[PDB]
């Protein structure tokens, strides 16, 4: 359970970073359509 808690935290952090990165790229791509 201690290892589980650590791994949940690490992956939660990574996914958040990836979603933020994806949101920023999505906005850039939509602007570039013009």
């Amino acid at each position: 359970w201690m290892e589980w808690d650590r791994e949940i935290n690490k992956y939660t952090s990574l996914i958040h970073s990836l979603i933020e990165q994806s949101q920023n790229q999505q906005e850039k791509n939509e602007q570039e359509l013009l």
């Binding site: 359970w1 949940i8 939660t12 996914i15 979603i19 994806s22 999505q26 791509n29 939509e30 359509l33």
Partner: protein
């Protein structure tokens, strides 16, 4: 345009799935606290 639209769709799906994942993590943590 339609490719970019599809990326918007899939990102939205991923975001909603992340909300579901966070909910399941919360649920397991509550149950773990109790059955320990």
């Amino acid at each position: 345009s339609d490719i970019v639209q599809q990326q918007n769709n899939l990102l939205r799906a991923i975001e909603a799935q992340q909300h579901l994942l966070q909910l399941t993590v919360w649920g397991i943590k509550q149950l773990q606290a109790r059955i320990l």
